[PDB]
Amino acid sequence: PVAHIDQFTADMLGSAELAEEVNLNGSGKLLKITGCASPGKTVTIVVRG
Amino acid sequence: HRPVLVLSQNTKRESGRKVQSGNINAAKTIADIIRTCLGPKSMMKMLLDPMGGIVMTNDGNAILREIQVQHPAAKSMIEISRTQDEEVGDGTTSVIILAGEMLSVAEHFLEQQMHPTVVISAYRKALDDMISTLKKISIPVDISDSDMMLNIINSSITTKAISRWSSLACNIALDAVKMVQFEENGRKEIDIKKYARVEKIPGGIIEDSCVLRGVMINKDVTHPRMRRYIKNPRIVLLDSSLEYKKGESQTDIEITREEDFTRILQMEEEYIQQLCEDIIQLKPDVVITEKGISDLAQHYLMRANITAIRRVRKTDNNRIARACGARIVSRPEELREDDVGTGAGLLEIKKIGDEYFTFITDCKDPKACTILLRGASKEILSEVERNLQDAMQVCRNVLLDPQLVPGGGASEMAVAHALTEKSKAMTGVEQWPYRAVAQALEVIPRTLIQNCGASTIRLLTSLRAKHTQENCETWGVNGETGTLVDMKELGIWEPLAVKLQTYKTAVETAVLLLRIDDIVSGHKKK
Amino acid sequence: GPLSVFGDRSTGETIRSQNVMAAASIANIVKSSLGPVGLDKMLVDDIGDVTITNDGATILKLLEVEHPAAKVLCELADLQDKEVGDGTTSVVIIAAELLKNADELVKQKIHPTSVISGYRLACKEAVRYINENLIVNTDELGRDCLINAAKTSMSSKIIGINGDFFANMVVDAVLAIKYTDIRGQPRYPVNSVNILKAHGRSQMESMLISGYALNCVVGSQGMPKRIVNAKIACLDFSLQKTKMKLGVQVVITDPEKLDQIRQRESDITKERIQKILATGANVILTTGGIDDMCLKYFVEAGAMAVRRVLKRDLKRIAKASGATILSTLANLEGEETFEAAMLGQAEEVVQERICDDELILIKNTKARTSASIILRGANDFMCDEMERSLHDALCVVKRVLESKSVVPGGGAVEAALSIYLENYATSMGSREQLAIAEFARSLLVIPNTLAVNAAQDSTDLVAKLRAFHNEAQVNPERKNLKWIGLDLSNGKPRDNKQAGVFEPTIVKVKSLKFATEAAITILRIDDLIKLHPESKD
Amino acid sequence: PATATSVDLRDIKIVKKLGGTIDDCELVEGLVLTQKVSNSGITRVEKAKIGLIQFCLSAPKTDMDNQIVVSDYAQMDRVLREERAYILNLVKQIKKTG
Ligand SMILES: Nc1ncnc2c1ncn2[C@@H]1O[C@H](COP(=O)(O)OP(=O)(O)O)[C@@H](O)[C@H]1O
Numbered sequence A: 001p002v003a004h005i006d007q008f009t010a011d012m013l014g015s016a017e018l019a020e021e022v023n024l025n026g027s028g029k030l031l032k033i034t035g036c037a038s039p040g041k042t043v044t045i046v047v048r049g
Numbered sequence B: 001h002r003p004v005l006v007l008s009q010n011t012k013r014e015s016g017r018k019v020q021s022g023n024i025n026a027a028k029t030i031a032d033i034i035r036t037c038l039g040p041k042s043m044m045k046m047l048l049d050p051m052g053g054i055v056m057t058n059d060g061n062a063i064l065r066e067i068q069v070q071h072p073a074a075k076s077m078i079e080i081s082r083t084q085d086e087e088v089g090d091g092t093t094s095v096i097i098l099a100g101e102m103l104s105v106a107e108h109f110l111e112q113q114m115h116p117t118v119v120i121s122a123y124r125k126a127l128d129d130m131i132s133t134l135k136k137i138s139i140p141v142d143i144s145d146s147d148m149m150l151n152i153i154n155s156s157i158t159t160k161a162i163s164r165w166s167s168l169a170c171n172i173a174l175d176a177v178k179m180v181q182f183e184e185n186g187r188k189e190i191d192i193k194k195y196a197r198v199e200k201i202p203g204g205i206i207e208d209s210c211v212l213r214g215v216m217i218n219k220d221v222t223h224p225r226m227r228r229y230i231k232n233p234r235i236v237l238l239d240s241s242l243e244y245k246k247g248e249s250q251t252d253i254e255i256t257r258e259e260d261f262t263r264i265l266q267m268e269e270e271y272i273q274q275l276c277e278d279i280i281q282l283k284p285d286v287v288i289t290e291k292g293i294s295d296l297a298q299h300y301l302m303r304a305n306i307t308a309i310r311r312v313r314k315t316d317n318n319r320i321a322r323a324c325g326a327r328i329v330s331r332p333e334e335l336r337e338d339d340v341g342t343g344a345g346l347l348e349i350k351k352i353g354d355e356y357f358t359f360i361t362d363c364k365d366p367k368a369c370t371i372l373l374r375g376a377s378k379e380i381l382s383e384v385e386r387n388l389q390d391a392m393q394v395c396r397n398v399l400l401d402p403q404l405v406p407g408g409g410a411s412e413m414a415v416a417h418a419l420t421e422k423s424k425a426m427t428g429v430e431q432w433p434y435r436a437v438a439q440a441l442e443v444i445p446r447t448l449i450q451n452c453g454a455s456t457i458r459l460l461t462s463l464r465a466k467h468t469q470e471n472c473e474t475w476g477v478n479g480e481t482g483t484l485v486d487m488k489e490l491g492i493w494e495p496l497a498v499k500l501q502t503y504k505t506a507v508e509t510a511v512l513l514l515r516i517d518d519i520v521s522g523h524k525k526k
Numbered sequence C: 001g002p003l004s005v006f007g008d009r010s011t012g013e014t015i016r017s018q019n020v021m022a023a024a025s026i027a028n029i030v031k032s033s034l035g036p037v038g039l040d041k042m043l044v045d046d047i048g049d050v051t052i053t054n055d056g057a058t059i060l061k062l063l064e065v066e067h068p069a070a071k072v073l074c075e076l077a078d079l080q081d082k083e084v085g086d087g088t089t090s091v092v093i094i095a096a097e098l099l100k101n102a103d104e105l106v107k108q109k110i111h112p113t114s115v116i117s118g119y120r121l122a123c124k125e126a127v128r129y130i131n132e133n134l135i136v137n138t139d140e141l142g143r144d145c146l147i148n149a150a151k152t153s154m155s156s157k158i159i160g161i162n163g164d165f166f167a168n169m170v171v172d173a174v175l176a177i178k179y180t181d182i183r184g185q186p187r188y189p190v191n192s193v194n195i196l197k198a199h200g201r202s203q204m205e206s207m208l209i210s211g212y213a214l215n216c217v218v219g220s221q222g223m224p225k226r227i228v229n230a231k232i233a234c235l236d237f238s239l240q241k242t243k244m245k246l247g248v249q250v251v252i253t254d255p256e257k258l259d260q261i262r263q264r265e266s267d268i269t270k271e272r273i274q275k276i277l278a279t280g281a282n283v284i285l286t287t288g289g290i291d292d293m294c295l296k297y298f299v300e301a302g303a304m305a306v307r308r309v310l311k312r313d314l315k316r317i318a319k320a321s322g323a324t325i326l327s328t329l330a331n332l333e334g335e336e337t338f339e340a341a342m343l344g345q346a347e348e349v350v351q352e353r354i355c356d357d358e359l360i361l362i363k364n365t366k367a368r369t370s371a372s373i374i375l376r377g378a379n380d381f382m383c384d385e386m387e388r389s390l391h392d393a394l395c396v397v398k399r400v401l402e403s404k405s406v407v408p409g410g411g412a413v414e415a416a417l418s419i420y421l422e423n424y425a426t427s428m429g430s431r432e433q434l435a436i437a438e439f440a441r442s443l444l445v446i447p448n449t450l451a452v453n454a455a456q457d458s459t460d461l462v463a464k465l466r467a468f469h470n471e472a473q474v475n476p477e478r479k480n481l482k483w484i485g486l487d488l489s490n491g492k493p494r495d496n497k498q499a500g501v502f503e504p505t506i507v508k509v510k511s512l513k514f515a516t517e518a519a520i521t522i523l524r525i526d527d528l529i530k531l532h533p534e535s536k537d
Numbered sequence D: 001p002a003t004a005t006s007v008d009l010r011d012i013k014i015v016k017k018l019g020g021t022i023d024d025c026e027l028v029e030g031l032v033l034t035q036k037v038s039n040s041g042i043t044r045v046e047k048a049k050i051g052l053i054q055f056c057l058s059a060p061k062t063d064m065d066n067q068i069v070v071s072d073y074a075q076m077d078r079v080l081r082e083e084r085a086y087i088l089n090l091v092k093q094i095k096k097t098g
C-alpha cells in the first residue's frame, strides 16, 4: 500500500501475467488477474447461477 | 388478520373474444364522435377543458386531444390523429373513420374462426397495392404557378371554418410558406412552426387580417425619448445583457481606503459605457436584446438616437434574425458589419387596443413572416389559427412532393375497384379479407353524403358504376350540392402526401389492434 | 407445543401444489404469445400507460407478482435477454411444465431427489444430442442462413411480413459492425446500433442509416444544418463560463483590477473555442453544456455545435469516425494543443425532418462504416413494440455469426428430443427412468402450444410430427427426417431445411439448461415459512 | 500443510454473479474485482505490474483549510496551469515506475 507519491517505487509494485476485464454475457463484467510471482495464501471462488 | 395467499394482487385478466371484439367497439366509438366533421357540410363541436377555456372546432385532431378515455385501445386511436397532425396538415379525421371501418370489416372475419394473422397478412398485401394505385392516378403540379397552388389550398380549407373567406385565407397561407422557404446549404427546408408565427389580436374584422412582410412583437420602447418611427433602421440583435450583474465566481472586495468604494461604483458605470461604445461603432438604429437593459445603458442610446427594445423572447429573436438578415451576437465588443440587419423596411410602434406592438415590416427579402390575425374574440381566432396551420402544411407537402390525388371520394373509389379486380387472381383463404379492404375504403364517400343529407343507396350505385370503365375514373362526391360531379371541373384536389399517410396509418392501426388478445391492468411502475 | 413463530407455516404437499399453480399462473399468460400465430397483449399501468408487447421479457418485468415461486420464473425471463437475447417465452413454458410433470411424480411417493438426478441425466443428454445432430454451419448456406434466422424471430411480432424488408435491415446492420478483437475474435456488438423511434410513415419506410443517427438538436438557429465533408470533434467538457472551484476565490484589494478578472472568465473560455475550431473542425459534440455566449463563435465561423449528448452516443461516434474522446488539455505540459491530427471524419452531417423533431445523421463516418436503424410506426405504441422486436432480431444474427451453428425451429428440436430421451431411459433406467420420461413430455409442450394458438388439430398434428422423428431414429436408412417441424399456415408437418425456419443452437441449449436449473430450486419447497410484514411493528 | 493446525476462511473470497449455471464456476487463484474500469478503452494488459495507490490524484488540498487568493489579471492563469503541472508530475512519477 503506497500512501505518499515519494515512496512509490518499483519494489512496491506487483506482477501479473494477464490483468484483463472479462466481458461477461450476464450481469455486467469483472476483473480477473491470472498468474502472479510468489502467490500468497489466498484464492477466489466465482459462483454462478 | 391472516392475509389470503394470492398471486398478482389487484389486477385484471381478460382474454378470448371479449378483447378481440372489444377493441373493435372502442374503435367504432371514436369513429362515431368525429363522423360529422369530415365533409364541407360539417359542423363545429364545442368542447370544455379543465383549464377553464372553451374549444369550439371541427378539426378531427383538436377534438380528440380534449377527450380523456379510459380504454387502452381507445388511447391508441387518439395517438393516430396526433401522428397525422404532425406529418401532414389536413390528414387526421379521414384516418380515424377509415381505421374504424377497416376494423369494422375485420370483426366479421373474427367470427368466422379466422386467425387475426391471416387478416393482417391480407391487410399488408392490400396496403402495398393502395400505394401503387395512387401513384398511377396522380398528376404532376407546376409549383411555379400561383393560381394552381391557390386551388390546392382552397380544397383543404373548404372543410374548415375559413371557407367563407376563401379569397383571403388562400393568399395568406401561400405567401407564408413561400417566404419561409429557406435554403442556406444544399438542403431545402420549410419551417412553418419556428418562423411562421401566427399572432392573434382580439378586435377588428377578419377581412383586415393579412400576412406581414416581417415579424412583430408585443413590446413597447424602453424610453419615451427614443423614436417610434424609423424608415430604414440598422437592427442589431443582442443576446447578453447591457447591465452589470454578479459574475460566476466568488468575487469579494476588501475596501480599506476611502477612495475604493467610490471607484467601484464608477467602474460599474464605465463598464456599461464600454459596451455601449462598442455597439455604436457600426452606427445602428434599433438595438434588440433578450435580457435586461439598465438605465445607464438607456442614457447612451438616448443621445445616440437609438431605439431599444428590452425583453424580446428567444423564439422571437431567431425569427427576426431571418426576416432582417441579422446575426444574434452575445458579445458587444465582438460585433461585426455582417451582424447588422440591414434591409429592414418601415419600423413603427403602433398601438392596437391600449397595447403597443413593435412592427418590423416591409422587408426586402425576409426568410420569416408573421401572420397578423384579427377577429371578434379569442374563441374564433384560435379556430383560424388552427385552420391556417392545416392550410400552411398542405402547401408544404406540394413543395416537397408535387403530386395531386383527386379527392372528394374519387380517390377512395378508384382504388376500391383496383383492389376488386386484383382480388380475382388470389384463389386462397386471404381473398375474402382482401375484398373487405375495398369495401372499407367506401366509407369516405359514404360520409360526404350523410353530412349533406343525400341518399346513400341511389348515389353509391351510380358512383360504383362510374369506376367500372377505365376512361374517366376521377368521379367523386360533390359535398356542396349532393350530386356526382367530376373532380376535373370542381377543382377538389388533395396532395399525395396526405393520401399516402391516410392509408398507411389506417391499415397499421388495424394491424396493431387485431394482434391484441389479452389485457392486464392493475400493476404499478417506478 | 407448536412453533412460536409469529408468521405462517405451511408444510407437506400444500406448498408442493402451490408452486406448480404459481408457475402455471405465469405460463398460461404467455402461452398465447408463442410462435408465428402468437398474439400481443396489453400492459396498462395504474396511471394509464399502455404497453403493447408480446415478448416474454417485457411482460413479466412490468407485471408485479407476490409468490416466491413466481419470482423465480420472472427472473428466468430476465436472464434469457442477457445470455441469449430471445427465448423469453419458450423458457418460461418449459420450466413451468417441468414442475407440472414433476408434481405428478412426487404425488406417486417418488422422492424429489430422484427427479432432480433424473432431470440432469436428461438435460445433459439433450445438449449432447443437439450438438451431434446439427444440420449445417454458415458456410454452405451463406447469406441465406442469416435472412432465414432473422425471419424466424420476427414471426412472433409486429414486423412479421412475408417479404425480406426487415430481414435485410438486420443482417446488413450486424454485418457492418464487425469489430475484430485480439486472439482472433470477430465480435459483433449489437448495442452500438442506435435504434430510434419516430411516429411517421408506414413500416416500409424504416430508414437504414449507414453511419450514426444522433437523437439531439443543433440548438441555436444560426448554424448550418448540413455540413459536407465534416470533421467531427468529439469532446466531453462543458463549454460554459469559467467558474473557479471551491478552494479558489477572488479577493481583490484594488478596484482597478476588477474588470480584468471579469473579462478573464470569458477570455479563457473563448481561448479554447478558437483553437479547437481553427484546425478544421465543423461538427462539435459535447456531453456537458454549451451556454449562449459560446454559441456565437460557431454561427460566425459556420460550424455545427451539438450540446448535451449522451455519453454512450459519443463513444459510438468517436469509435466509428476515428475521433478521440478528449476531456481536457494534455500532451506534456502544453498550453492548448488539442492534438488536431486526431479529429474525426464524416461524409455528410445533415439534420433531416423526422416529423416535427430534429435528428442529426452522420453518413458512413469514413473510418468504420457503422449503421443505425430509424424505425417508423403509426403511433408510440407500435414504435415501442418495433424497438423490442428489432432488438430480439439483432441478437439472433449475433449468435449465428459468432457460433456458426443453427437448429431447425418450429418444434423440430423438441420432437427429436421427445423420442430420444424415452429410449435413453429404457437402457440405464432403474429408479430414475420416470423422471427422464417426464422430461420428454415436458419438452412436447412447445409444439403443443403452436397447435392451440393456430386453432389447428392438437393431438393429431403433433402425433404426426413425432411419427417422422421416430422413423429417423429407429430406421437408419438416411431418411433425413430430423428437420420436420410445423406449418401453421397449412396445418401439416413441413421440412424446415427447405422452408427456411432456422434458430440458433444456444437458443435451445441455454433454454434447456436454464429451465432445468430453475425447476430444481422450485422442487425443494416442501416446507415453507412466511413471516408477517414488519412495517407497523 | 504439515506446518500449522489453523486455517482462516476469510482468505477465500466468494464472488456472487448472476448468469449461467453452476458448471460455470471457476477457481481463479488471482484477484477478482467487481469494480468497473475507467477508462475502459483498453481492458487488457499482458505482463502487467499492479500498484495499489492510496493517494488522491486531484487538486492539491490539505487537512487544514486552504484558500487561493486571486487579486491579479495573470493570477488566474497561474491557478489552472499550475494545477495541470502538479498532476502531470504525479502521472509521470507513476509512468516512470513501470
Ligand atoms: N368541395 C368538396 N367536395 C367533395 N369533397 C370534399 C370537398 N371539400 C372537402 N372534401 C372532402 O372532405 C374531406 C376532409 O378531410 P379532413 O377531415 O380535412 O382530413 P384531415 O383530418 O386529414 O385534415 C377530404 O378528404 C375531402 O375529400
Ligand SMILES: Nc1ncnc2c1ncn2[C@@H]1O[C@H](COP(=O)(O)OP(=O)(O)O)[C@@H](O)[C@H]1O
Pocket: C033, C034, C035, C036, C055, C056, C080, C085, C086, C087, C088, C089, C090, C091, C151, C152, C153, C155, C156, C392, C409, C410, C411, C485, C486, C487, C488, C501
Ligand atoms: N415459420 C415458423 N414455423 C414454425 N414455427 C415457428 C416459425 N417461426 C417461429 N416459430 C416458433 O415460434 C417460437 C417463438 O418463440 P419466442 O417467443 O420468440 O421465444 P423467446 O421468447 O425466447 O424469444 C419459436 O420457438 C419457434 O419454434
Ligand SMILES: [Mg+2]
Pocket: C086, C087, C152, C153, C154, C156, C392
Ligand atoms: Mg422470437
